[PDB]
Design a protein around this ligand. Structure first.
Ligand SMILES: NS(=O)(=O)c1ccc(Nc2nc(-c3cccc(-c4ccccc4)c3)c3[nH]cnc3n2)cc1
Lengths: 296, 255
């Protein structure tokens, strides 16, 4: 089963245990081998692995990390994935002195939006977009990568699992403790990351739900019933919230041009019904001159 | 999310055609029958109650069992083990708080070990080739409910009731796709309460006219009329309750 693969080195820990680099000894393919540990106790196979494997068998797209194979052995389950060289977190730390060129940021946003629109149109939200899970290769591609916190949604949605994106990239409708979130939570993440590539630092880097939420208020302003109908009767709204004024987006992301600002504001609309969908965003003027340059 | 209503409808229509169990399967099983399967599906409903599992979980559990049994012979002694492991998986896939493995062992009266339930889960996944994201009658109903003016809590719950009853009787319902069993359930519910028909918006959205629905609609009409005497009764009891507005009680129509 594993006779075929030679482990090269560990790479990281994701949402359910360890990921390694490996070589297919026979084809020469380099792969990422994610090891799950099973036990006639562990409640057998993890809920997170069940959703990742099943959802990701359905998602073949050039901007979603491809699942090549799933190896059941006796007490181990191995997921064989395509290998990418680096992630966007590491790349932004390595690109700090000279910044990421605007064509590349635009290439990468476009491709991620493509991957997201795809997911969403197959009833899947990712629920964990962050730079650690966006992988890049030397050719100028970028792909979505940890579908272990994903879930299949219905139309309309149900109440799903609550504390759900990593804090920094968590949308306000989760922080305010709404019933229903949908696709709009991933777009919010992607808008945050889009800001982060431009400025090289995280847009709303809180260390608690309330801190995260005040940080957002200080930059988009405190939402009231005009910009967000419903807002003041959501479960974790407090009338004792401070009222900050919305800042002009030229100050939120100074490198950004007339259009990138527009896009970014539509990605961070407070109301999830008006917040731009990945599908609509691909058509946005910002991308009229998009191409596909290479990094590194 | 009207941006992806249509893409998803379209995609779940592609998908229901691929998770289709073989209609004949029951005939090819040496040991089990349509009325062993009914006992089993009625029992899962009762498990769904005892752990307040979602309707979806039940519907996926049944889709997994029918595919499983489509390619794998099972003795009567293990039919329930197959059902348990399927219901575990469905819960893991669908529920926020899935029940611990121990809880499923407890509701089989320890006729199976935990060691068995886990081995069966591994096998049910191997045979289903990990393809657990199956369309259900419920995912169609839910979509359908938005083409309803005004919305009507009674209609929806009754629609769900008939969709759920369809899981019990493998003959005749194995031959209908879920989008159709949904169509019928919805229209039969809409007629039984408001006296309206399958709306034109749903003809534009599914391409099922009221006449393409007819075959299935004839069967569902009869399951519903004969539902009081049917040997398995947990679904009827379920839908007496305030949650579902007591629509199991509602007396079915003339034709
Ligand atoms: N660290 S680095 O930037 O130099 C770097 C180097 C190589 C990779 N290759 C890789 N990682 C993950 C993967 C999945 C989930 C989490 C992680 C992860 C990322 C960063 C730290 C720890 C784990 C990687 C994959 N999933 C499917 N295919 C994959 N391929 C990622 C990051």
């Amino acid at each position: 089963s594993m006779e075929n693969f030679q482990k090269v080195e560990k790479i990281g820990e994701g949402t359910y245990g360890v990921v390694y680099k490996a070589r297919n000894k026979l084809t020469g393919e380099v792969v990422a081998l994610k090891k799950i540990r099973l036990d006639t106790e562990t409640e057998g196979v993890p809920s997170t692995a069940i959703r990742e494997i099943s959802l990701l068998k359905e998602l073949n797209h050039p901007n979603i990390v491809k699942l090549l194979d799933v190896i059941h052995t006796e007490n181990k389950l191995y997921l064989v994935f395509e290998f990418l060289h680096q992630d966007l977190k590491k790349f932004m730390d390595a690109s700090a002195l000279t910044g990421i060129p605007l064509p590349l940021i635009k290439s990468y946003l476009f491709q991620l939006l493509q991957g997201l629109a795809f997911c969403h149109s197959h009833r899947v939200l990712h629920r964990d977009l962050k730079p650690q899970n966006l992988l890049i290769n030397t050719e100028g591609a970028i792909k979505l990568a940890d579908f272990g916190l994903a879930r299949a949604f219905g139309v309309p949605v149900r109440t799903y699992t609550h504390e759900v994106v990593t804090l920094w990239y968590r949308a306000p409708e989760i922080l305010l403790g709404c019933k229903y979130y949908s696709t709009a939570v991933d777009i919010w993440s992607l808008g945050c990351i889009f800001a982060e590539m431009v400025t090289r630092r995280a847009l709303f880097p809180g260390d608690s739900e309330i801190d995260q939420l005040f940080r957002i208020f200080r930059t988009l302003g405190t939402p009231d019933e005009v910009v967000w109908p419903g807002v003041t009767s959501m479960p974790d709204y407090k009338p004792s919230f401070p009222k900050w004024a919305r800042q002009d987006f030229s100050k939120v992301v100074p490198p950004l041009d007339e259009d990138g600002r527009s896009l970014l504001s539509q990605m961070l609309h407070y109301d999830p019904n008006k917040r731009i969908s990945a599908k609509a965003a691909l058509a946005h003027p910002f991308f009229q001159d998009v191409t596909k340059p290479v990094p590194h | 999310v009207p941006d992806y209503h249509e893409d998803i409808h379209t995609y779940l229509r592609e998908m229901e055609v691929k998770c289709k169990p073989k209609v004949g399967y029951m005939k090819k099983q040496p040991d089990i029958t349509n009325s062993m399967r009914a006992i089993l599906v009625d029992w899962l409903v009762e498990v769904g109650e005892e752990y307040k599992l979602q309707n979806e979980t039940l519907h996926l559990a049944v889709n997994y069992i029918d595919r499983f049994l489509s390619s794998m012979s099972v003795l009567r002694g293990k039919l329930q083990l197959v059902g348990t492991a399927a219901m575990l998986l469905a819960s893991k896939f669908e529920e926020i708080y899935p029940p611990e493995v121990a809880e499923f062992v407890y509701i089989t009266d320890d006729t199976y070990t935990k060691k068995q339930v886990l081995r069966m889960e591994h096998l049910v996944l191997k045979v289903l080739t990990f393809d657990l994201a199956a369309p259900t009658v419920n995912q169609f109903l839910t979509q359908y409910f938005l083409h309803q003016q005004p919305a009507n809590c009674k209609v929806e719950s009754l629609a769900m009731f008939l969709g759920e009853l369809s899981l019990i009787d493998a003959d005749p319902y194995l031959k209908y796709l879920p989008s159709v069993i949904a169509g019928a359930a919805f229209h039969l519910a809409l007629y039984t309460v408001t006296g309206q028909s399958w709306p034109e918006s749903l003809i534009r959205k599914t391409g099922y006219t009221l006449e393409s629905l007819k075959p299935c609609l004839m069967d569902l009409h009869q399951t519903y009329l004969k539902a009081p005497q049917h040997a398995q009764q947990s679904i009827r009891e379920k839908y007496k309750n305030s949650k579902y507005h007591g629509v199991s009680l509602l007396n079915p129509p003339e034709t």
